[PDB]
Design an enzyme around this catalytic site. Structure first.
Site, PDB file in Angstrom:
ATOM      1  N   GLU A  59       0.825  -1.205   0.000  1.00  0.00           N
ATOM      2  CA  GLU A  59       0.000   0.000   0.000  1.00  0.00           C
ATOM      3  C   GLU A  59       0.861   1.257   0.000  1.00  0.00           C
ATOM      4  O   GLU A  59       0.497   2.264  -0.617  1.00  0.00           O
ATOM      5  CB  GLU A  59      -0.946   0.002   1.200  1.00  0.00           C
ATOM      6  CG  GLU A  59      -1.979   1.123   1.163  1.00  0.00           C
ATOM      7  CD  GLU A  59      -2.465   1.530   2.542  1.00  0.00           C
ATOM      8  OE1 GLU A  59      -1.692   1.393   3.516  1.00  0.00           O
ATOM      9  OE2 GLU A  59      -3.625   1.983   2.652  1.00  0.00           O
ATOM     10  N   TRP A  81      -8.768  -1.940   0.022  1.00  0.00           N
ATOM     11  CA  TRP A  81      -9.541  -0.811  -0.480  1.00  0.00           C
ATOM     12  C   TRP A  81     -10.640  -1.207  -1.459  1.00  0.00           C
ATOM     13  O   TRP A  81     -11.402  -0.335  -1.894  1.00  0.00           O
ATOM     14  CB  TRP A  81      -8.617   0.214  -1.146  1.00  0.00           C
ATOM     15  CG  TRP A  81      -7.784   1.001  -0.180  1.00  0.00           C
ATOM     16  CD1 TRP A  81      -6.425   1.113  -0.179  1.00  0.00           C
ATOM     17  CD2 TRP A  81      -8.252   1.781   0.929  1.00  0.00           C
ATOM     18  NE1 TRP A  81      -6.018   1.917   0.856  1.00  0.00           N
ATOM     19  CE2 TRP A  81      -7.120   2.339   1.552  1.00  0.00           C
ATOM     20  CE3 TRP A  81      -9.519   2.062   1.454  1.00  0.00           C
ATOM     21  CZ2 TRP A  81      -7.213   3.163   2.675  1.00  0.00           C
ATOM     22  CZ3 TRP A  81      -9.610   2.880   2.570  1.00  0.00           C
ATOM     23  CH2 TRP A  81      -8.464   3.420   3.166  1.00  0.00           C
ATOM     24  N   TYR A 107      -4.827   9.627  -0.682  1.00  0.00           N
ATOM     25  CA  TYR A 107      -3.465   9.795  -0.172  1.00  0.00           C
ATOM     26  C   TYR A 107      -2.421   9.938  -1.274  1.00  0.00           C
ATOM     27  O   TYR A 107      -1.622  10.878  -1.267  1.00  0.00           O
ATOM     28  CB  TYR A 107      -3.100   8.617   0.736  1.00  0.00           C
ATOM     29  CG  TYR A 107      -4.039   8.393   1.901  1.00  0.00           C
ATOM     30  CD1 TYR A 107      -3.995   9.213   3.019  1.00  0.00           C
ATOM     31  CD2 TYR A 107      -4.951   7.346   1.892  1.00  0.00           C
ATOM     32  CE1 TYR A 107      -4.843   9.007   4.092  1.00  0.00           C
ATOM     33  CE2 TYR A 107      -5.804   7.129   2.959  1.00  0.00           C
ATOM     34  CZ  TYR A 107      -5.744   7.962   4.056  1.00  0.00           C
ATOM     35  OH  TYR A 107      -6.590   7.751   5.121  1.00  0.00           O
ATOM     36  N   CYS A 167      -7.641   9.369   7.043  1.00  0.00           N
ATOM     37  CA  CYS A 167      -7.508   9.131   8.474  1.00  0.00           C
ATOM     38  C   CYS A 167      -6.152   9.601   8.989  1.00  0.00           C
ATOM     39  O   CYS A 167      -6.081  10.294  10.009  1.00  0.00           O
ATOM     40  CB  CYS A 167      -7.722   7.648   8.785  1.00  0.00           C
ATOM     41  SG  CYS A 167      -9.436   7.124   8.577  1.00  0.00           S
ATOM     42  N   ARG A 187      -6.729  11.369  12.627  1.00  0.00           N
ATOM     43  CA  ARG A 187      -7.992  11.891  13.137  1.00  0.00           C
ATOM     44  C   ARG A 187      -8.870  10.792  13.722  1.00  0.00           C
ATOM     45  O   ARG A 187      -9.685  11.060  14.613  1.00  0.00           O
ATOM     46  CB  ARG A 187      -8.749  12.616  12.024  1.00  0.00           C
ATOM     47  CG  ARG A 187      -9.088  11.715  10.840  1.00  0.00           C
ATOM     48  CD  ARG A 187     -10.223  12.266  10.000  1.00  0.00           C
ATOM     49  NE  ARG A 187     -10.581  11.343   8.929  1.00  0.00           N
ATOM     50  CZ  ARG A 187     -11.505  10.391   9.031  1.00  0.00           C
ATOM     51  NH1 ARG A 187     -12.181  10.231  10.161  1.00  0.00           N
ATOM     52  NH2 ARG A 187     -11.755   9.598   7.998  1.00  0.00           N
ATOM     53  N   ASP A 190      -8.990   3.138  14.432  1.00  0.00           N
ATOM     54  CA  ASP A 190      -9.521   1.812  14.742  1.00  0.00           C
ATOM     55  C   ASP A 190      -8.438   1.048  15.490  1.00  0.00           C
ATOM     56  O   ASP A 190      -7.521   0.492  14.883  1.00  0.00           O
ATOM     57  CB  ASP A 190      -9.933   1.090  13.463  1.00  0.00           C
ATOM     58  CG  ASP A 190     -10.743  -0.173  13.729  1.00  0.00           C
ATOM     59  OD1 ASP A 190     -10.641  -0.740  14.838  1.00  0.00           O
ATOM     60  OD2 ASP A 190     -11.468  -0.612  12.812  1.00  0.00           O
TER      61      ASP A 190
HETATM   62  C1  LIG Z   1      -3.828  -9.273   9.983  1.00  0.00           C
HETATM   63  O1  LIG Z   1      -4.238 -10.046   8.862  1.00  0.00           O
HETATM   64  C2  LIG Z   1      -4.821  -9.394   7.798  1.00  0.00           C
HETATM   65  C3  LIG Z   1      -4.944 -10.120   6.600  1.00  0.00           C
HETATM   66  C4  LIG Z   1      -5.526  -9.533   5.464  1.00  0.00           C
HETATM   67  C5  LIG Z   1      -6.002  -8.205   5.501  1.00  0.00           C
HETATM   68  C6  LIG Z   1      -6.620  -7.636   4.228  1.00  0.00           C
HETATM   69  C7  LIG Z   1      -8.144  -7.571   4.331  1.00  0.00           C
HETATM   70  O2  LIG Z   1      -8.550  -6.721   5.320  1.00  0.00           O
HETATM   71  O3  LIG Z   1      -8.893  -8.214   3.594  1.00  0.00           O
HETATM   72  C8  LIG Z   1      -5.891  -7.454   6.704  1.00  0.00           C
HETATM   73  N1  LIG Z   1      -6.362  -6.105   6.733  1.00  0.00           N
HETATM   74  C9  LIG Z   1      -5.684  -5.046   7.220  1.00  0.00           C
HETATM   75  O4  LIG Z   1      -4.553  -5.129   7.701  1.00  0.00           O
HETATM   76  C10 LIG Z   1      -6.325  -3.685   7.150  1.00  0.00           C
HETATM   77  C11 LIG Z   1      -7.682  -3.443   6.813  1.00  0.00           C
HETATM   78  C12 LIG Z   1      -8.174  -2.117   6.770  1.00  0.00           C
HETATM   79  C13 LIG Z   1      -7.324  -1.024   7.059  1.00  0.00           C
HETATM   80  C14 LIG Z   1      -7.795   0.421   7.022  1.00  0.00           C
HETATM   81  C15 LIG Z   1      -9.283   0.627   6.901  1.00  0.00           C
HETATM   82  C16 LIG Z   1      -9.958   0.988   5.759  1.00  0.00           C
HETATM   83  N2  LIG Z   1     -11.303   1.079   6.062  1.00  0.00           N
HETATM   84  C17 LIG Z   1     -11.485   0.780   7.390  1.00  0.00           C
HETATM   85  N3  LIG Z   1     -12.700   0.767   8.056  1.00  0.00           N
HETATM   86  C18 LIG Z   1     -12.623   0.451   9.319  1.00  0.00           C
HETATM   87  N4  LIG Z   1     -13.712   0.381  10.162  1.00  0.00           N
HETATM   88  N5  LIG Z   1     -11.425   0.144   9.988  1.00  0.00           N
HETATM   89  C19 LIG Z   1     -10.226   0.147   9.370  1.00  0.00           C
HETATM   90  O5  LIG Z   1      -9.178  -0.120   9.957  1.00  0.00           O
HETATM   91  C20 LIG Z   1     -10.261   0.497   7.935  1.00  0.00           C
HETATM   92  C21 LIG Z   1      -5.979  -1.270   7.386  1.00  0.00           C
HETATM   93  C22 LIG Z   1      -5.490  -2.584   7.428  1.00  0.00           C
HETATM   94  C23 LIG Z   1      -5.297  -8.060   7.842  1.00  0.00           C
HETATM   95  O1  LIG Z   2      -5.785   4.134   7.755  1.00  0.00           O
HETATM   96  C1  LIG Z   2      -6.866   3.979   8.321  1.00  0.00           C
HETATM   97  C2  LIG Z   2      -8.174   4.035   7.678  1.00  0.00           C
HETATM   98  C3  LIG Z   2      -9.304   3.843   8.402  1.00  0.00           C
HETATM   99  N1  LIG Z   2      -9.305   3.596   9.769  1.00  0.00           N
HETATM  100  C4  LIG Z   2     -10.615   3.396  10.502  1.00  0.00           C
HETATM  101  C5  LIG Z   2     -10.930   4.463  11.558  1.00  0.00           C
HETATM  102  C6  LIG Z   2     -12.447   4.368  11.580  1.00  0.00           C
HETATM  103  O2  LIG Z   2     -12.870   3.321  12.428  1.00  0.00           O
HETATM  104  C7  LIG Z   2     -12.801   4.096  10.114  1.00  0.00           C
HETATM  105  C8  LIG Z   2     -13.111   5.372   9.309  1.00  0.00           C
HETATM  106  O3  LIG Z   2     -14.356   5.966   9.639  1.00  0.00           O
HETATM  107  P1  LIG Z   2     -14.522   7.560   9.919  1.00  0.00           P
HETATM  108  O4  LIG Z   2     -13.777   8.103  11.088  1.00  0.00           O
HETATM  109  O5  LIG Z   2     -14.132   8.197   8.481  1.00  0.00           O
HETATM  110  O6  LIG Z   2     -16.132   7.743   9.968  1.00  0.00           O
HETATM  111  O7  LIG Z   2     -11.652   3.445   9.572  1.00  0.00           O
HETATM  112  C9  LIG Z   2      -8.065   3.526  10.449  1.00  0.00           C
HETATM  113  O8  LIG Z   2      -7.962   3.307  11.655  1.00  0.00           O
HETATM  114  N2  LIG Z   2      -6.910   3.723   9.692  1.00  0.00           N
END
Ligand SMILES: COc1ccc(CC(=O)O)c(NC(=O)c2ccc(Cc3c[nH]c4nc(N)[nH]c(=O)c34)cc2)c1
Ligand SMILES: O=c1ccn([C@H]2C[C@H](O)[C@@H](COP(=O)(O)O)O2)c(=O)[nH]1
Ligand SMILES: COc1ccc(CC(=O)O)c(NC(=O)c2ccc(Cc3c[nH]c4nc(N)[nH]c(=O)c34)cc2)c1
Ligand SMILES: O=c1ccn([C@H]2C[C@H](O)[C@@H](COP(=O)(O)O)O2)c(=O)[nH]1
Lengths: 285, 285
Positions: A59, A81, A107, A167, A187, A190
């Site tokens: 990424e 994504w 980004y 974020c 900001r 998670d």
């Molecule tokens: C540990 O083993 C694995 C194996 C495979 C995968 C890929 C998959 O996820 O399929 C993963 N994934 C991630 O590491 C992952 C997933 C989402 C982000 C950011 C992000 C976007 N949008 C969000 N929305 C919310 N609520 N929270 C968030 O965190 C985000 C950052 C990292 C982990």
């Molecule tokens: O790089 C990233 C992208 C997303 N999120 C998480 C935070 C929130 O749980 C969610 C985004 O929702 P909002 O704050 O935009 O509503 O994704 C992360 O922690 N890191």
């Protein structure tokens, strides 16, 4: 070092407040947190659970290239994504002309072409907008004492055109005693899912820039706005909170690289990564 | 509460590293700091030394009006920006076309017209650019759980046109249990001079927005990038470090105000402010 992330988890479960959010899931939320992770002869890849290292590296290379095409990242095996670039999600937000996998000005576009007019994910914006990433590298090489080495992704003009607003919105670099440090302002964090990913992402970026500028990696300062634990993550994080942290792995760059764009995925090598088993944590959509 | 600012001073004097900067003066610098100031039934106006309260109130009303004219602020008795707007200073940075007192696209312009094309300090930009301040107020009233209530002043496009780039570059608001909190990211903090001023300024802005949105003031989270103590400030800060902090004063708003633009300087009243004597600290130019 990893005890700081675990201390933040323990603090949210003990002192956090219930808080609804953009999704139907609830959270335990805390506003305003900060942790410091040492990058000196170690790489902060969490050991109390497996972190998706392949997604972290791919990424970031996707960010550096300035790409906004989720399908271009999905082709490398990283589908983090794809949900925000799906045809049914672009249609819901009114993006009825964007092809599937066009996230908009995100980004990669903000790091390399801040201010440029966004067309589509297939356009070439070379020479348009402000290249914040290269100016950051230039200022480090010529004026390390500068207190303005800042890369900002928060563009209020381009916000309505993004599938998800940034974020990790702003980061700042700092040089002293030939050590490169980086502070990230996030900001929204998670704590179960994104935060371990973001820590590894920006620690990697610091290693890349320190390699280019001839400096040694210093510290990564993680500053959070809304640090929240989703309700369905409480028990997965209670399991992790009982695991004894193991020593961080190490990151080796395999060849001397001149420009930030010359980095390939094969140039990196993680050593000694012995994490605890993966803990499943569903993503709130 | 005031012990957190004094603890940060003590930490920089004890653990800071020598570091030169844009001026000829040196500093003791620390990268990455955070403090939390309670706004609940108290106002964080430092008591270990007198803080220029008249300048805090007048400069914020100057920001809210969107003005970039230093002479308009200097006419109210506050001359904190005249150095960066003097004819002999604009010429030094090549600004050989602006009338004296034109700082360019700065805090007031970025808060109210982000993205708009900057002409001069005398133009009327009503309806142009992004009004970040009003959308922050709107989002608080309609969606307090939103994790995106952000006001950003860092515009890489407008950076070369500013006499001084923003120090308080990004701030975020947060609502829970009907309490309004604000976190500020400050890229560069003059711990002797600017930081006590900036704390009172953003605590005041939170009181203003909490008054309009019907919320109670919560916390102010001050996050710093380069937290530095100038060499000529070491000894003045050692005097202050020996003074026993006194209870914070209180801030009362004298009339019910509907819009952020309707606030006047006479609407505010500081009560019980009994600070220690002023400590002279020269400004590094
Ligand atoms: C540990 O083993 C694995 C194996 C495979 C995968 C890929 C998959 O996820 O399929 C993963 N994934 C991630 O590491 C992952 C997933 C989402 C982000 C950011 C992000 C976007 N949008 C969000 N929305 C919310 N609520 N929270 C968030 O965190 C985000 C950052 C990292 C982990
Ligand atoms: O790089 C990233 C992208 C997303 N999120 C998480 C935070 C929130 O749980 C969610 C985004 O929702 P909002 O704050 O935009 O509503 O994704 C992360 O922690 N890191
Ligand atoms: C008794 O207390 C008083 C009385 C009167 C005055 C007005 C006057 O100063 O005449 C002051 N002043 C300030 O409160 C002041 C001055 C400068 C700022 C920001 C600022 C701009 N540019 C900078 N450059 C450096 N190095 N450091 C900084 O801090 C800044 C913030 C506050 C204090
Ligand atoms: O609101 C403000 C404005 C300025 N400064 C100080 C920080 C630095 O000492 C100096 C700005 O210099 P640069 O960081 O741009 O070099 O002014 C503050 O603390 N607060």
């Amino acid at each position: 070092s990893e005890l700081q992330y675990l201390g933040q988890i323990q603090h949210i479960l003990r002192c956090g407040v219930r808080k609804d959010d953009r999704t139907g899931t609830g959270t335990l939320s805390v506003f305003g947190m900060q942790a410091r992770y040492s990058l000196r002869d170690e790489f902060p890849l969490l050991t109390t659970k497996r972190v998706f290292w392949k997604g972290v590296l791919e990424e970031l290379l996707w960010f550096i290239k300035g790409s906004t095409n989720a399908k271009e990242l999905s082709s490398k095996g990283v589908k983090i994504w794809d949900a925000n670039g799906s045809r049914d999600f672009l249609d819901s937000l009114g993006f009825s002309t964007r092809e599937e996998g066009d996230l908009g000005p995100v980004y990669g576009f903000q790091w390399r072409h801040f201010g440029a007019e966004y067309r589509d994910m297939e356009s070439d914006y070379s020479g348009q907008g402000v290249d914040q990433l290269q100016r950051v590298i230039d200022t480090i090489k010529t004026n390390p004492d500068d207190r303005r080495i800042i890369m900002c992704a928060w563009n209020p003009r381009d916000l309505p055109l993004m599938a998800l607003p940034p974020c990790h919105a702003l980061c700042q670099f700092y040089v002293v005693n030939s050590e490169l440090s980086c502070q990230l302002y996030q900001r929204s964090g998670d704590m179960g899912l994104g935060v371990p990913f973001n820590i590894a992402s920006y620690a990697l970026l610091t290693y890349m820039i320190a390699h280019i500028t001839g400096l040694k990696p210093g510290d990564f300062i993680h500053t959070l706005g809304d640090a929240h634990i989703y309700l369905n993550h409480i028990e997965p994080l209670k399991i992790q909170l009982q695991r004894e942290p193991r020593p961080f792995p190490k990151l080796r760059i395999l060849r001397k690289v001149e420009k930030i764009d010359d980095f390939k995925a094969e140039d990196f090598q993680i050593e000694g990564y012995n994490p605890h088993p993966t803990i499943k944590m569903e993503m709130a959509v």
